[PDB]
A paper describes a structure:
PanD is a proenzyme and in the structure, we observed the processed active enzyme after cleavage between Gly24 and Ser25, and modification of Ser25 to a pyruvoyl group (Pyr25). The active protein consists of a β chain (Met1-Gly24) and an α chain (Pyr25 to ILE115). Our results show that resistance to PZA in PanD mutants primarily comes from alterations in two loops covering the active site that have subtle, but significant effects on the affinity and residence time of POA on the enzyme rather than from directly affecting POA binding interactions.
The crystal structures of apo Mtb PanD and the Mtb PanD:POA complex were solved using molecular replacement and both structures were refined to 2.7 Å resolution. In the POA complex structure, there was one molecule of POA bound to each Mtb PanD active site, which was located at the interface between two adjacent subunits of the PanD tetramer. The density for POA was clearly visible in a difference electron density map made by subtracting the structure factor amplitudes of the apo crystal diffraction data from that of the PanD:POA complex, as well as a polder OMIT map. There were four hydrogen bonds that contribute significantly to the binding between POA and PanD: two between POAs carboxylate oxygens and the amide groups on the backbone of Ala74 (2.7 Å) and Ala75 (2.7 Å), one between a carboxylate oxygen to the guanidinium group of Arg54* (2.8 Å), and another between the N1 on the POA pyrazine ring and Arg54* (2.9 Å). Thus, POA binds to the active site of Mtb PanD interacting with the same groups as the substrate, and this is consistent with a competitive mode of inhibition. The POA binding pocket is relatively small (206 Å3) and not easily accessible, as there is only a narrow tunnel leading from the active site to the inside barrel of the PanD tetramer. While we cannot be certain through which portal the substrate or inhibitor enters the active site, the protein must undergo a significant conformational change to allow substrate or POA access to the active site.
Numbering used by the authors:
A (entry chain B), C (entry chain D), E (entry chain B), G (entry chain D): 25 to 115
B (entry chain A), D (entry chain C), F (entry chain A), H (entry chain C): 1 to 24
The structure:
């Protein structure tokens, strides 16, 4: 794979190669892939390879990253949540 | 004991393109 | 995503944002999502977003979290297993 | 060596609502 | 969930509550569940809850456990592989 | 750096029973 | 499972028994399995057992392994990405 | 905080054989 606008990756605290779960609001697909850095400010959300069978251009998706963390940090950790407009620009 | 926790969420993004035959 | 009554989260030792597997006894769906804290004692089990395609109101579900732990702790660890009535109240 | 173990289980809960278009 | 004969759990180095992947040779189902200790020497392989939709009595299955381990140990680690007869007794 | 490795395999077991409505 | 030519395993930094995700470009199948070392330089990509229901001879596949690593290492780590010709030889 | 990262990728390999009834 998923090509993500570098701005959304920074906003969401995603690295190139970080594992990402894509969930499709339109068709209910759920898959696991990794993040590829997309052209900054382009609003790109690009589905690459086998995933393109399940998640399609025009679909509304949620992109999710998880972390493994010790019990203590897990209870206090605040996730980075990015809301976006219809053009995939952060709010 | 390690838990799996939400760290990142991009909420209700629009897929802009797809390539079945991507190389990268 | 899944909104869970805070009482069930405490009973099951689940944190807000902790990864959760939902399995559907009615339709056999299996998905991975995260826990959101729901109004305490309301018995809410709310499916939010893409998951609503797979898991439907009225469905009987099992909610599961796993942990990674060293061999020694794994042999001694007691999982928190919560049985609930038809109104999602612990027994 | 770390094992992946069951830590939490809510058994046979009833889904009370569903929202495709949740925001949160 | 999966109820496993305590003999197979010992043979395979599985604990009660350890995460297990079931893969179905008959129907191609693949799911993630945890191990429950079954009556020793009974040859029980019991599918409990939502998984029963996907994996059925009479099906040939492979049960798999994974571990997270540091690079050094990963290169040297020898997995426990259990072959079984038609009655689920180790060989 | 942690890898996920095979530790356990029970090969070609026969499912003996199933219960949709198990409690445990 | 998946039998992989030892050359591709070395090129991709995969160990025998390391968990591997297979994604099928032809049919959109996605499954999790482990790597088995195949005859070196044979270009073997062999689907063994239950996975053969989902991933078929002649299919174009991507084989993926992930690692858990501390924030600092994650930002600097270079993944081993292997492009292959129609005969499964590295380029 | 540990992240899950891509470490290995074999890109667009061709499946050479399949055996439902493999033993190993
Ligand atoms: O083609 C895909 O869908 C893919 C590629 N790499 C990793 C995960 N998924
Ligand atoms: O919409 C969903 O189903 C969802 C949302 N966030 C995380 C996981 N799943
Ligand atoms: O009912 C099931 O299939 C189940 C139950 N607990 C954990 C995983 N799966
Ligand atoms: O038969 C399979 O597909 C299989 C076997 N072992 C591990 C994972 N998958």
């Amino acid at each position: 794979x998923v090509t993500i606008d570098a701005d959304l990756m920074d906003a969401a605290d995603l690295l190139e190669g970080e594992q990402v779960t894509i969930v499709d609001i339109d068709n209910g697909a759920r898959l696991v892939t990794y993040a590829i850095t997309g052209e900054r400010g382009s609003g790109v959300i690009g589905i690459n390879g086998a995933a393109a069978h399940l998640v399609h251009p025009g679909d509304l998706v949620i992109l999710i990253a998880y972390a493994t963390m010790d019990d203590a940090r897990a209870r206090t950790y605040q996730p980075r949540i990015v809301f976006v407009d219809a053009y995939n620009k952060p709010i | 004991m390690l838990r799996t926790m939400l760290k990142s969420k991009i909420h209700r993004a629009t897929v802009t393109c797809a390539d079945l035959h991507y190389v990268g």
